[PDB]
Write a protein that binds this ligand. Structure first.
Ligand code: NA
Length: 130
């Protein structure tokens, strides 16, 4: 599923993302935009370490989910990476929350640092009623 902007804004809000561990909704929106273009079945293979980035938040298999084919990986979110390719994003949101509970927080994603950090991201939620 490829979400419309405001459609995603309200979906994330209903899932408890607005201000989670201090991260505004607009930051979560900006992250999803640059990571996947709001596409829940987006995937990216990294031949180097045999890992794959899954879903709307492009969460990596070396640490967060199990796909069975990533050498010496772990499963911190305790989910099959398939759960991160569902049209319903509740499981992906639970995993993104687990990711930010680590030391780096939202900085865990390099795309956030490049396209969202030190910028006014309010434009991602403007007009969505959130
Ligand atoms: Na894994």
């Amino acid at each position: 599923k490829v979400f419309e902007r405001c459609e995603l804004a309200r979906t994330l809000k209903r899932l408890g993302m607005d201000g989670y561990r201090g991260i505004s909704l607009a930051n979560w929106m900006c992250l999803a935009k640059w990571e996947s273009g709001y596409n829940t079945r987006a995937t990216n293979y990294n031949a180097g370490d045999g890992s794959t980035d899954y879903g709307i938040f492009q969460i990596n298999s070396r640490y967060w989910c199990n796909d069975g084919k990533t050498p010496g990986a772990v499963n911190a979110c305790h989910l099959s990476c398939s759960a991160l390719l569902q049209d319903n994003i509740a499981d992906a949101v639970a995993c993104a929350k687990r990711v930010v509970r680590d030391p780096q927080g939202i900085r865990a994603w390099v795309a956030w640092r490049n396209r969202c950090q030190n910028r006014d991201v309010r434009q991602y939620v403007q007009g969505c009623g959130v």
